[PDB]
Amino acid sequence: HQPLIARDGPHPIEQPTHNYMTKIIDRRALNAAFSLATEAIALLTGEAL
Amino acid sequence: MLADGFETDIAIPSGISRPDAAALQRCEGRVVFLPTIRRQLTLADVAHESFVSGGVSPDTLGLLLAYRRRFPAVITRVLPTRIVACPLDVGLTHAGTVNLRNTSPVDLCNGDPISLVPPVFEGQATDVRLDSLDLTLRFPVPLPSPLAREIVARLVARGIRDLNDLNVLYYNGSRLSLLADVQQLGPVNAELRSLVLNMVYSITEGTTIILTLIPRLFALSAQDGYVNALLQMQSVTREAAQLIHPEAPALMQDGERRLPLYEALVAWLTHAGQLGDTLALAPVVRVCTFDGAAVVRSGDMAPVIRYP
Amino acid sequence: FETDIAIPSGISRPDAAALQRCEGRVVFLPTIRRQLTLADVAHESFVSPDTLGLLLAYRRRFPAVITRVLPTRIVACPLDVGLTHAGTVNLRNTSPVDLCNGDPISLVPPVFEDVRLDSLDLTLRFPVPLPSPLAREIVARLVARGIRDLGLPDLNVLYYNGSRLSLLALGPVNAELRSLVLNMVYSITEGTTIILTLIPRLFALSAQDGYVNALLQMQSVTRERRLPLYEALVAWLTHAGQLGDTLALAPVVRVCTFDGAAVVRSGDMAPVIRYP
Amino acid sequence: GSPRHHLTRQVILTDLCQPNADRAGTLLLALRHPADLPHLAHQRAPPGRQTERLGEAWGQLMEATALRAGLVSFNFLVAACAASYDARDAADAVRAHVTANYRGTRVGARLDRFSECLRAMVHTHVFPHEVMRFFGGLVSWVTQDELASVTAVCAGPQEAAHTGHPGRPRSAVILPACAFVDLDAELGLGGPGAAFLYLVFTYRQRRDQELCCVYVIKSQLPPRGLEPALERLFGRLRITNTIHGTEDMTPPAPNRNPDFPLAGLAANPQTPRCSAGQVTNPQFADRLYRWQPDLRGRPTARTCTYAAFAELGMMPEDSPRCLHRTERFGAVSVPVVILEGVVWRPGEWRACA
């Protein structure tokens, strides 16, 4: 809203107003790599063949 | 209410895009030419589409002559379904105060009568075009009256040239120029007739006495700094005094009972003093700022109460 | 709506009596405002201007008629925004002219004949509410006098409402009205030569024979070194278009009498409306 | 909601207007005080017309009503100018109840006299659009011997003012069908819109063959743009005034003025000139060019007027409604145009020179 101060005498200017503001989302992304060698996956999995 | 105000309803159609719908809401205090005093009209009537003559879209001088055949109205609130205006010839509002908006590059002051002028200036030809409806809205420019008598004089005197520069104005030391374009021969001849009629009708038998004062003005211009600042550097009566020595006829027919100068001045006021209303339209409107500021800047609103 | 013109303190005994007499009289304010000092009203605010300077100033300013006068403030209502709301505001003659019913009344600067407050150090000039068909006469007679100084005894005789006016009654008003005379003559002598350069034949034609047949062509619709002529057109249309406003004397006031006499004499009050 | 209007009262002699015969809802036109008439004729007349005619024509009217800024009702004014309208079948019907309903002896001797006054007005050149002033339309009256108390609306809507009789309190604007000239039908404007009402006089300036017509014109045009519409109707009167309105003014025979030589004098540098101090000295002003313009007997603008209009009011409807009925004024049936809902606004006159 646009705020109001009242004035005396004859009424020169206003009718009460609104403002509809719209703003555009800017999208981004974040990356983080992570590696595991085959020497460790055989420990995380379980039994062998 | 019926007497004090008169609200028209310029209807807005169904199919309007929002790039077009958000342009009308910036057109809050404008000047709109209704052809009638109907209470329900459409945008195809207001716009420049209805302004065209038979096939010929007229230039800035013929744009004058179809203003004064119409009714100036001021937008008071833009609703989504309609535009509400108030024609100035009927009445303003109950309170009698309608806010306008400067489109001029020129400030306003208190008590200046407003006449409206076409978008004549350069950097000023701003036509709100609605693409979904193919509508342009050529909004006129509210100017002070001593500008509006210059510009009409600059446009009418320019067409008298081309029947056989000028376009540079100055107001309060700010340079501004108006656009130059070839003029349609039709409306120019409608302006020349309104000159010469109101010009020849201001000539009376008593004016041959006033013409004998031309050597009195010129001999006075060497003493008074008011008359030297009056005549002009490029006037005619300065060159009429250096070459022609006029003198009056001695007697008048029935010269006892009639007043020769009194009939000459009244005929001058009703025909040549009236001339500024016969070329342009009437200054209905003047500015009465109440408490804000005595000078209204460009792009700002200004309260308005009617003038005779 | 009513404005308040507050009197500054320091009022002597005759000075409160002089402001008590101006009950129904016209006052020019600069801008419509509730708080307003008396010094913006008075003749000090106009600087001394001549008759042309008053005619310019009486169009930029906004007229107001005084209501009841309080001992502390002057309560006045303006003729533009405050009179369409209320019904009828009384107005007093300062004129020698009797007002009739139904006249449109403009205002004239005080040419004919000054309430001065001595303690406050200011004067007060008040306009003359005479009807508009006389306003285009009384100005036009006096401008026609000043041209003769660069007369005729009927020029000073005005009959309105069966009453004789004498404009003569001469010295200082001649020097007071000088800038009108220098602008009225010039705008005609420039006017009747530019016509006479564009169409140079207009005096050489025979009066009732050739000039009429050349006049009927001007009236009909169906017929369609260098002199600085076309720069003098613009020079004349802005000056003659300026004197068209100032010497219009467009009417503010229309008198509609109700339960009273049809003729309002000098010194009496007249009821006033400006709206249907 | 009740609209706002303004009443006037005035004690009026009933010589020229009759609020009893003319019922509630007719126009009223006020005059100047007639002591001003024989002097304005002495001053504003063109050279060579009888200034001693207006003072005699009005003197024959006051000596005809005995067998003071008064009032002339519209129905009295139409029947006085009744010998100049097109619809003469109805113009002799308006006169038919003027002589038969108005209180007095030989009312038919006033109409032939008051029209002789109006012919003396055009001839002695005090035009009655400078004399006839608008006064409001009738709402009620109070009768008395030789005078009446007239109540009227100087400004406002006609249908708001209360009449006084609670049987029929309202009043519509009543006009005879001889003066009411449309410009919607005759031009082809059939579209809706608010319409303006105008009072229009017309003259015709000849030697002892002069006329008068009073019209009430309803139009959708502004007062700034009426002059092209009055010219189209009354252009016949415009032509007859420019050639016959200038008579007994003595012309210069033959011409004495040569052509105006400033375009030829200023081009040649050999032409003798003068300085600012050299002019207005006879030794140096006789060396210049002598130029004696003769404006005598020219058809000036005020001697070429054919009409004069003014604002009168409006109808703020979308489609303004007129009627054409034949009301009975006593025993005479008269074609009457009835206007519905007129909002009064006076205005200043404007000559069509």
PDB file of C-alpha atoms in Angstrom, chain D residues 8-124:
ATOM      1  CA  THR D   8     -36.637  34.819  -8.965  1.00  0.00           C
ATOM      2  CA  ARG D   9     -39.509  37.106  -8.042  1.00  0.00           C
ATOM      3  CA  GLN D  10     -40.296  40.412  -9.707  1.00  0.00           C
ATOM      4  CA  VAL D  11     -43.267  42.784  -9.609  1.00  0.00           C
ATOM      5  CA  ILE D  12     -44.088  43.234 -13.285  1.00  0.00           C
ATOM      6  CA  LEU D  13     -46.554  45.353 -15.257  1.00  0.00           C
ATOM      7  CA  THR D  14     -48.837  43.182 -17.389  1.00  0.00           C
ATOM      8  CA  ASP D  15     -48.869  45.265 -20.572  1.00  0.00           C
ATOM      9  CA  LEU D  16     -46.642  43.045 -22.702  1.00  0.00           C
ATOM     10  CA  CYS D  17     -46.619  39.702 -20.857  1.00  0.00           C
ATOM     11  CA  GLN D  18     -49.603  37.867 -19.378  1.00  0.00           C
ATOM     12  CA  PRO D  19     -48.914  35.049 -16.881  1.00  0.00           C
ATOM     13  CA  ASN D  20     -52.640  34.185 -16.923  1.00  0.00           C
ATOM     14  CA  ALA D  21     -53.100  33.592 -20.645  1.00  0.00           C
ATOM     15  CA  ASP D  22     -49.618  32.183 -21.124  1.00  0.00           C
ATOM     16  CA  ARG D  23     -49.752  29.293 -18.686  1.00  0.00           C
ATOM     17  CA  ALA D  24     -47.016  27.986 -16.413  1.00  0.00           C
ATOM     18  CA  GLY D  25     -43.990  26.999 -18.459  1.00  0.00           C
ATOM     19  CA  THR D  26     -43.262  29.634 -21.109  1.00  0.00           C
ATOM     20  CA  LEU D  27     -40.198  31.742 -21.825  1.00  0.00           C
ATOM     21  CA  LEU D  28     -39.851  35.296 -20.520  1.00  0.00           C
ATOM     22  CA  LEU D  29     -37.611  37.996 -21.969  1.00  0.00           C
ATOM     23  CA  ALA D  30     -36.743  41.122 -19.995  1.00  0.00           C
ATOM     24  CA  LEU D  31     -35.907  44.526 -21.434  1.00  0.00           C
ATOM     25  CA  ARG D  32     -33.778  47.503 -20.663  1.00  0.00           C
ATOM     26  CA  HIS D  33     -35.378  50.527 -19.083  1.00  0.00           C
ATOM     27  CA  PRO D  34     -36.893  52.320 -22.101  1.00  0.00           C
ATOM     28  CA  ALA D  35     -35.344  55.693 -21.271  1.00  0.00           C
ATOM     29  CA  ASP D  36     -32.090  54.220 -22.568  1.00  0.00           C
ATOM     30  CA  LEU D  37     -33.551  53.406 -26.005  1.00  0.00           C
ATOM     31  CA  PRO D  38     -33.916  56.916 -27.589  1.00  0.00           C
ATOM     32  CA  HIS D  39     -30.340  57.850 -26.691  1.00  0.00           C
ATOM     33  CA  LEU D  40     -28.540  54.671 -27.751  1.00  0.00           C
ATOM     34  CA  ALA D  41     -30.274  55.119 -31.103  1.00  0.00           C
ATOM     35  CA  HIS D  42     -28.860  58.650 -31.243  1.00  0.00           C
ATOM     36  CA  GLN D  43     -25.340  57.302 -30.698  1.00  0.00           C
ATOM     37  CA  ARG D  44     -24.947  53.842 -32.269  1.00  0.00           C
ATOM     38  CA  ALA D  45     -26.705  54.550 -35.548  1.00  0.00           C
ATOM     39  CA  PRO D  46     -24.834  54.437 -38.867  1.00  0.00           C
ATOM     40  CA  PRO D  47     -24.678  57.720 -40.817  1.00  0.00           C
ATOM     41  CA  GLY D  48     -27.847  58.618 -42.675  1.00  0.00           C
ATOM     42  CA  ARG D  49     -30.526  56.745 -40.737  1.00  0.00           C
ATOM     43  CA  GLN D  50     -33.348  58.345 -38.763  1.00  0.00           C
ATOM     44  CA  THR D  51     -32.311  58.457 -35.126  1.00  0.00           C
ATOM     45  CA  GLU D  52     -35.648  60.182 -34.390  1.00  0.00           C
ATOM     46  CA  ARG D  53     -37.520  56.971 -35.279  1.00  0.00           C
ATOM     47  CA  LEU D  54     -36.914  54.789 -32.225  1.00  0.00           C
ATOM     48  CA  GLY D  55     -38.044  57.522 -29.842  1.00  0.00           C
ATOM     49  CA  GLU D  56     -41.251  57.934 -31.817  1.00  0.00           C
ATOM     50  CA  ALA D  57     -42.049  54.256 -32.356  1.00  0.00           C
ATOM     51  CA  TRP D  58     -41.806  53.433 -28.664  1.00  0.00           C
ATOM     52  CA  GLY D  59     -43.843  56.534 -27.850  1.00  0.00           C
ATOM     53  CA  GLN D  60     -46.715  55.195 -29.934  1.00  0.00           C
ATOM     54  CA  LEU D  61     -46.717  51.989 -27.865  1.00  0.00           C
ATOM     55  CA  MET D  62     -47.027  53.553 -24.411  1.00  0.00           C
ATOM     56  CA  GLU D  63     -49.894  55.660 -25.755  1.00  0.00           C
ATOM     57  CA  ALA D  64     -51.544  52.462 -27.006  1.00  0.00           C
ATOM     58  CA  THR D  65     -51.431  50.460 -23.758  1.00  0.00           C
ATOM     59  CA  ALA D  66     -53.071  53.178 -21.633  1.00  0.00           C
ATOM     60  CA  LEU D  67     -56.450  52.837 -23.364  1.00  0.00           C
ATOM     61  CA  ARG D  68     -40.285  50.303 -15.467  1.00  0.00           C
ATOM     62  CA  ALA D  69     -37.981  47.613 -16.889  1.00  0.00           C
ATOM     63  CA  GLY D  70     -40.772  45.231 -17.808  1.00  0.00           C
ATOM     64  CA  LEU D  71     -41.096  41.824 -19.392  1.00  0.00           C
ATOM     65  CA  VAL D  72     -42.163  40.356 -22.749  1.00  0.00           C
ATOM     66  CA  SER D  73     -43.486  36.808 -22.787  1.00  0.00           C
ATOM     67  CA  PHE D  74     -42.392  34.540 -25.617  1.00  0.00           C
ATOM     68  CA  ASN D  75     -45.886  33.976 -27.004  1.00  0.00           C
ATOM     69  CA  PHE D  76     -46.316  37.731 -27.266  1.00  0.00           C
ATOM     70  CA  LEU D  77     -42.981  38.087 -29.054  1.00  0.00           C
ATOM     71  CA  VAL D  78     -43.695  35.349 -31.607  1.00  0.00           C
ATOM     72  CA  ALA D  79     -47.082  36.782 -32.587  1.00  0.00           C
ATOM     73  CA  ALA D  80     -45.571  40.243 -33.014  1.00  0.00           C
ATOM     74  CA  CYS D  81     -43.034  38.874 -35.513  1.00  0.00           C
ATOM     75  CA  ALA D  82     -45.676  36.597 -37.068  1.00  0.00           C
ATOM     76  CA  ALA D  83     -45.404  38.113 -40.564  1.00  0.00           C
ATOM     77  CA  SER D  84     -41.965  36.607 -41.208  1.00  0.00           C
ATOM     78  CA  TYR D  85     -42.211  32.843 -40.601  1.00  0.00           C
ATOM     79  CA  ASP D  86     -42.549  29.984 -43.049  1.00  0.00           C
ATOM     80  CA  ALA D  87     -45.448  28.108 -41.418  1.00  0.00           C
ATOM     81  CA  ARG D  88     -47.957  30.929 -41.790  1.00  0.00           C
ATOM     82  CA  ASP D  89     -50.846  28.563 -41.034  1.00  0.00           C
ATOM     83  CA  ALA D  90     -49.613  28.232 -37.451  1.00  0.00           C
ATOM     84  CA  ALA D  91     -48.143  31.743 -37.188  1.00  0.00           C
ATOM     85  CA  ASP D  92     -51.654  33.142 -37.581  1.00  0.00           C
ATOM     86  CA  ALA D  93     -52.768  30.710 -34.878  1.00  0.00           C
ATOM     87  CA  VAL D  94     -50.337  32.101 -32.306  1.00  0.00           C
ATOM     88  CA  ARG D  95     -51.663  35.587 -33.055  1.00  0.00           C
ATOM     89  CA  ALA D  96     -55.215  34.197 -32.787  1.00  0.00           C
ATOM     90  CA  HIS D  97     -55.062  33.702 -29.016  1.00  0.00           C
ATOM     91  CA  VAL D  98     -52.751  36.660 -28.332  1.00  0.00           C
ATOM     92  CA  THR D  99     -55.479  39.087 -29.349  1.00  0.00           C
ATOM     93  CA  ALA D 100     -58.263  36.975 -27.863  1.00  0.00           C
ATOM     94  CA  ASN D 101     -56.981  35.962 -24.426  1.00  0.00           C
ATOM     95  CA  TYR D 102     -54.850  38.923 -23.314  1.00  0.00           C
ATOM     96  CA  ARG D 103     -56.594  41.249 -20.879  1.00  0.00           C
ATOM     97  CA  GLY D 104     -57.192  44.667 -22.384  1.00  0.00           C
ATOM     98  CA  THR D 105     -58.812  46.723 -25.110  1.00  0.00           C
ATOM     99  CA  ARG D 106     -57.490  46.287 -28.672  1.00  0.00           C
ATOM    100  CA  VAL D 107     -54.588  43.928 -28.066  1.00  0.00           C
ATOM    101  CA  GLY D 108     -54.418  43.654 -31.866  1.00  0.00           C
ATOM    102  CA  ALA D 109     -53.262  47.280 -31.922  1.00  0.00           C
ATOM    103  CA  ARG D 110     -50.241  46.413 -29.765  1.00  0.00           C
ATOM    104  CA  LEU D 111     -48.868  43.659 -32.011  1.00  0.00           C
ATOM    105  CA  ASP D 112     -48.841  45.915 -35.059  1.00  0.00           C
ATOM    106  CA  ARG D 113     -47.194  48.542 -32.844  1.00  0.00           C
ATOM    107  CA  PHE D 114     -44.650  46.414 -30.971  1.00  0.00           C
ATOM    108  CA  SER D 115     -43.510  44.945 -34.283  1.00  0.00           C
ATOM    109  CA  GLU D 116     -43.147  48.526 -35.489  1.00  0.00           C
ATOM    110  CA  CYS D 117     -40.942  49.022 -32.439  1.00  0.00           C
ATOM    111  CA  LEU D 118     -38.802  46.019 -33.411  1.00  0.00           C
ATOM    112  CA  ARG D 119     -38.518  47.362 -36.960  1.00  0.00           C
ATOM    113  CA  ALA D 120     -37.405  50.636 -35.455  1.00  0.00           C
ATOM    114  CA  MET D 121     -34.843  48.711 -33.384  1.00  0.00           C
ATOM    115  CA  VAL D 122     -33.100  47.189 -36.425  1.00  0.00           C
ATOM    116  CA  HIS D 123     -33.345  50.455 -38.366  1.00  0.00           C
ATOM    117  CA  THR D 124     -32.127  52.721 -35.558  1.00  0.00           C
TER     118      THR D 124
END
